[PDB]
Amino acid sequence: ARVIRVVVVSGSLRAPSRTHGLLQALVERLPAVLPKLEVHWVRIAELSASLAGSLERDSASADLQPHLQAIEQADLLLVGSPVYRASYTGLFKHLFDLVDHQSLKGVPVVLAATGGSERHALMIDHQLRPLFAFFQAHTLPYGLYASVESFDDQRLADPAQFERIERVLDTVGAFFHIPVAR
């Protein structure tokens, strides 16, 4: 079996964050569907310095290069952003403005977001999904959207979200043709 390279992009501007907690909950259950995997994180909240210094892919700062390569070489991408101005954060977007635009074609992508309100639940399908559709990535059908009520501080605490995570993982296992049994 091939080790599946999983890269997790957390778009929060600050740490700790509910978006991070949502991504952790997903990541924690990932080994139940993938027999071999390496999981790596790209956390915007720690990259503001490297991000500012990077205006083109080929000229990106040496310290951002590892994060870009990881995304560009991932077998599976999990992405999450809190909702800002009814979309993902601009710094999360700046990251993807640098990511090679041929590199994600056909790559499975899980979309996730956290918001202050349910009113922006459509950000998943009208903002995050189109972003990854530009890359022609294989966005997976079930996106995660959790508003503030789903969390205890920054930890996911909502049984309905834990269940939807399991449905996401069903689709991850199916995509990698992992013989369906857990």
* Residues at the interface with Na ion (CB under 5 A): 103
Q: Considering beta carbons, is residue 29 or 101 the nearer one to Na ion?
A: 101
Min dist. Cβ of residue 57 to Na ion (A): 14
Using CA atoms, how far apart are residues 153 and 139, in angstroms rounded to an integer? 29
Min dist. Cβ of residue 16 to Na ion (A): 29
Min dist. Cβ of residue 122 to Na ion (A): 28
Do 53 and 83 touch, CB atoms closer than 8 A? no
Q: Which residue has the tokens 């959207």?
A: 145
Q: Considering beta carbons, is residue 83 or 109 the nearer one to Na ion?
A: 109
Backbone CA torsion sign across 70, 72, 76, 82: positive
119 CA to centre of own chain: 21
92 CA to centre of own chain: 10
Kindly tell me the burial class for residue 152, based on how many C-beta atoms sit within 10 Å of its own C-beta (0-12, 13-18, 19 or more): exposed
Q: Which residues of 91-114 are buried (b: 16+ CB within 10 A; e: fewer)?
A: bbebbbebbeeebbeebbbbbbbb
Min dist. Cβ of residue 74 to Na ion (A): 6
Q: Considering beta carbons, is residue 78 or 146 the nearer one to Na ion?
A: 78
Q: Considering beta carbons, is residue 14 or 105 the nearer one to Na ion?
A: 105
Min dist. Cβ of residue 119 to Na ion (A): 34
Using CA atoms, how far apart are residues 117 and 86, in angstroms rounded to an integer? 10
Q: Considering beta carbons, is residue 24 or 103 the nearer one to Na ion?
A: 103
Q: Considering beta carbons, is residue 4 or 25 the nearer one to Na ion?
A: 4
Residue nearest to Na ion according to CB distances in the complex: 103
Min dist. Cβ of residue 142 to Na ion (A): 22
